[PDB]
Amino acid sequence: RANINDIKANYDRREQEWTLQKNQADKDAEQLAHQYTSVQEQLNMAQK
């Protein structure tokens, strides 16, 4: 029964780690959207 509890606890810990990695990838996408906007406005500045 202790081994069952440890297996399920490791499953919960890797669910928490997956949640952290998913949130960090969402924050990286929210960064790269604004950086795409910056490079596109640099393109408008060079095209002027």
Next chain:
Amino acid sequence: VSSVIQFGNSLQSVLERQDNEAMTLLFQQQQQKVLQHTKDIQNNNIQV
């Protein structure tokens, strides 16, 4: 004839100052346009 030569020199002086004023006025107009397109460049530079 000396009077004719004197007014020929005066006509040459006036007639070259007229063309120099035309060139100066054209340069002022087109620099006035360039210094507005540079303001547009500096408008995009803050959006970046």
